[PDB]
Amino acid sequence: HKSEVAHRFKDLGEENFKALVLIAFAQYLQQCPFEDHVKLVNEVTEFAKTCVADESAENCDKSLHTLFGDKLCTVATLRETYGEMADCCAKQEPERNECFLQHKDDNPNLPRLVRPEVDVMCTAFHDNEETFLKKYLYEIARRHPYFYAPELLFFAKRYKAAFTECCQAADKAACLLPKLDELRDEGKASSAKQRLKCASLQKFGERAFKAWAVARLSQRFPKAEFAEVSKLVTDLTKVHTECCHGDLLECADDRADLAKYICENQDSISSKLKECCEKPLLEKSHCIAEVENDEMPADLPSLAADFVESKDVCKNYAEAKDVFLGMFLYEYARRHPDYSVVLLLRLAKTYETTLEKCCAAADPHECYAKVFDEFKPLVEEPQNLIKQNCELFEQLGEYKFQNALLVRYTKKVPQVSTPTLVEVSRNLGKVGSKCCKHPEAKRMPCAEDYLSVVLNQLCVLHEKTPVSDRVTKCCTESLVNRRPCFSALEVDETYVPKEFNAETFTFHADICTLSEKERQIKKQTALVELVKHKPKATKEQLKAVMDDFAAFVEKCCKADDKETCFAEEGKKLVAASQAALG
Numbered sequence: 369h370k371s372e373v374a375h376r377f378k379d380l381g382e383e384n385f386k387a388l389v390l391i392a393f394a395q396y397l398q399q400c401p402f403e404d405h406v407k408l409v410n411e412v413t414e415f416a417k418t419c420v421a422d423e424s425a426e427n428c429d430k431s432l433h434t435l436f437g438d439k440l441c442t443v444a445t446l447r448e449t450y451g452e453m454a455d456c457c458a459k460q461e462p463e464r465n466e467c468f469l470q471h472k473d474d475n476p477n478l479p480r481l482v483r484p485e486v487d488v489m490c491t492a493f494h495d496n497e498e499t500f501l502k503k504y505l506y507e508i509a510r511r512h513p514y515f516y517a518p519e520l521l522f523f524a525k526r527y528k529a530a531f532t533e534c535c536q537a538a539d540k541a542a543c544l545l546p547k548l549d550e551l552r553d554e555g556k557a558s559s560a561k562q563r564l565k566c567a568s569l570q571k572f573g574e575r576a577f578k579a580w581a582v583a584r585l586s587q588r589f590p591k592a593e594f595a596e597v598s599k600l601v602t603d604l605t606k607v608h609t610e611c612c613h614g615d616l617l618e619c620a621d622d623r624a625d626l627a628k629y630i631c632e633n634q635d636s637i638s639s640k641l642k643e644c645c646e647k648p649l650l651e652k653s654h655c656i657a658e659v660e661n662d663e664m665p666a667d668l669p670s671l672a673a674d675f676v677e678s679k680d681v682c683k684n685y686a687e688a689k690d691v692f693l694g695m696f697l698y699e700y701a702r703r704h705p706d707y708s709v710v711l712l713l714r715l716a717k718t719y720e721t722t723l724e725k726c727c728a729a730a731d732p733h734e735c736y737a738k739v740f741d742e743f744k745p746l747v748e749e750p751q752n753l754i755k756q757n758c759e760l761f762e763q764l765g766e767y768k769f770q771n772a773l774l775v776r777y778t779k780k781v782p783q784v785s786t787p788t789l790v791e792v793s794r795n796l797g798k799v800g801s802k803c804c805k806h807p808e809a810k811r812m813p814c815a816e817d818y819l820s821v822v823l824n825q826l827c828v829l830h831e832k833t834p835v836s837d838r839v840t841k842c843c844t845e846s847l848v849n850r851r852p853c854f855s856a857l858e859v860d861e862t863y864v865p866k867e868f869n870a871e872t873f874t875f876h877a878d879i880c881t882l883s884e885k886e887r888q889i890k891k892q893t894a895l896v897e898l899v900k901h902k903p904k905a906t907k908e909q910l911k912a913v914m915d916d917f918a919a920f921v922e923k924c925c926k927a928d929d930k931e932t933c934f935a936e937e938g939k940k941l942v943a944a945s946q947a948a949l950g
């Protein structure tokens with residue numbers, strides 16, 4: 369196009385254009401104030417319309433990266449606020465832009481964003497809506513500089529609905545809060561998920577990623593031919609590779625381009641794309657990536673014709689090991705949407721191992737006639753972890769269930785930070801909440817998604833603050849080994865029980881007047897220091913105590929005179945349990 373800006377403005381819309389320019393500049397100039405940024409958006413939007421009016425207007429033919437950089441090099445305090453980043457302005461565009469990508473801060477030092485009161489929030493949102501969103505949109509961006517922009521916009525649009533609906537309600541907070549937490553968590557997960565995909569692209573390699581996508585894709589579009597999926601795995605790989613490079617616009621077009629190919633090849637890909645394809649440039653990619661799996665053929669043979677029996681298995685496999693193995697994954701995944709992607713790589717890594725062995729045999733066929741046999745236990749184990757856990761969760765409530773997990777893990781690795789356990793057990797604990805709601809069909813996949821972040825997130829904390837060679841192994845190991853590795857952890861025997869401290873176990877009436885969360889976070893934080901002091905406790909010697917506490921509260925919060933009750937009663941509880949747990 370004669371004018372990069374004229375185009376992006378025209379098919380995004382003025383509204384979407386400004387939100388996107390804001391986030392863009394908010395991720396770079398993270399230290400400037402809101403008024404300052406609003407400055408740019410308006411300076412830029414005014415310039416843009418210039419270009420829409422005349423594609424040949426002054427400076428409209430300049431590239432975005434160029435225009436973007438110029439504006440970046442426009443800030444007066446650039447050199448004294450961003451220091452090095454300012455040295456980027458002394459470079460020619462191709463490098464400049466590249467220098468600006470490197471001089472960005474992943475984790476800045478801004479304070480945590482504090483959720484105001486539903487009243488002041490709803491008020492503010494009402495008074496000056498636009499600013500209310502753009503500002504906090506500004507606030508999210510500057511804290512998550514790498515978070516893909518458009519997606520951040522989708523959360524914005526959502527957050528906006530959260531208010532539109534709830535602020536005009538009766539028991540507002542009862543409507544908004546259990547939406548903000550959902551939107552928060554949800555965005556914290558989206559942030560961790562794209563941060564990992566890239567972490568995966570470097571440590572593990574191009575091949576490994578490709579393996580991943582052939583599976584998730586044929587699992588998604590199971591009616592595509594192998595060649596059609598390969599095309600996509602290839603186009604997709606480019607995408608993540610560039611997007612993981614940082615450049616937003618480069619990343620954006622790769623995504624746009626690909627979605628164009630997919631929409632002009634629906635008949636060749638899925639039938640579930642009518643909708644998504646019918647949307648405007650902004651939604652397509654997003655929409656598609658979220659579309660449901662198409663239904664499979666139904667007649668579909670059995671993977672035994674081409675991978676076990678049939679002559680020339682080794683002949684085919686040896687000609688192009690990967691294309692072959694890819695064809696295994698393809699054929700295997702498409703007949704199993706119910707499978708966790710990583711479980712499919714496990715099966716395939718097996719089959720692989722097998723051929724490298726059996727195709728170097730006297731009578732091959734005989735050597736691997738027993739291969740699909742080795743798949744049942746690999747499949748079973750993860751399936752049976754779900755049963756057991758969801759069964760357990762149908763039994764106890766989410767909370768009562770998050771405490772089983774708490775004790776479970778506190779005994780697995782007592783060394784880990786107490787606050788880290790509560791959090792893990794909680795986040796981990798939720799997972800069963802919104803996965804065990806799905807029937808078998810969607811479960812296992814479900815878990816792999818959430819469990820993947822909850823685990824990486826856990827590794828990172830352990831990365832920065834190592835604490836157990838064991839979680840380092842599980843965290844250092846391969847993706848296919850990660851999750852199972854963790855389920856392998858056994859109760860720690862070498863552990864030496866944390867010596868006692870009544871302060872850690874002493875409770876004041878303030879608990880009576882605490883927000884449920886706080887109350888739970890508080891019961892659980894102790895339940896842990898409890899397992900950490902008296903680890904050799906039976907869920908028997910342990911289900912107790914927890915009960916003498918259940919009413920220990922009812923006995924001091926209902927009381928006319930708390931304060932002291934939480935002292936005289938307290939001494940009695942601690943004492944009763946000092947002995948109970950010999």
Ligand SMILES: Cc1cn([C@H]2C[C@H](N=[N+]=[N-])[C@@H](CO)O2)c(=O)[nH]c1=O
Nearest residue numbers: 514516519558561562607608611612
């Ligand atoms: C997994 C995932 C990726 N993405 C984006 C972010 C990634 N770039 N970065 N950073 C990009 C990789 O193709 O897709 C997304 O918007 N939502 C998601 O759930």
Ligand SMILES: CCCCCCCCCCCCCC(=O)O
Nearest residue numbers: 481483504505508520524527552
């Ligand atoms: C891109 C997101 C735009 C969302 C705008 C946020 C307005 C909501 C107020 C903050 C709510 C969550 C803050 C928090 O949970 O700490």
Ligand SMILES: CCCCCCCCCCCCCC(=O)O
Nearest residue numbers: 388436518620623624649650653
């Ligand atoms: C300084 C000017 C900045 C302009 C930024 C324009 C960003 C346009 C993003 C379009 C993203 C489409 C994403 C998609 O289709 O998945």
Ligand SMILES: CCCCCCCCCCCCCC(=O)O
Nearest residue numbers: 576579598601690691693694717
């Ligand atoms: C587009 C080419 C398709 C290639 C498919 C390659 C599949 C081979 C990977 C086998 C699984 C073990 C490799 C890994 O560690 O992820």
Ligand SMILES: CCCCCCCCCCCCCC(=O)O
Nearest residue numbers: 753773777780781784792854855
């Ligand atoms: C273990 C100290 C950190 C706590 C988490 C360790 C185990 C997390 C693995 C979760 C995977 C399976 C879920 C489960 O089996 O309960």
Ligand SMILES: CCCCCCCCCCCCCC(=O)O
Nearest residue numbers: 710711750757796797800815851
């Ligand atoms: C709150 C209870 C949550 C329990 C969820 C456990 C689900 C286990 C998922 C196992 C995934 C295995 C992945 C793999 O083997 O590659």
Ligand SMILES: CCCCCCCCCCCCCC(=O)O
Nearest residue numbers: 873891894895914917918942945
């Ligand atoms: C040394 C003995 C200390 C006694 C402290 C017990 C710890 C109690 C944790 C309570 C968990 C209960 C959850 C609930 O009450 O619903």
Ligand SMILES: O=C(O)c1ccccc1O
Nearest residue numbers: 508523551552555556559
């Ligand atoms: O912190 C949030 O509330 C949030 C929301 C959406 C996306 C990323 C986020 O951090």
Ligand SMILES: O=C(O)c1ccccc1O
Nearest residue numbers: 623626627653654656657
């Ligand atoms: O971004 C896409 O275009 C996409 C397409 C298919 C599957 C996952 C995806 O993220």
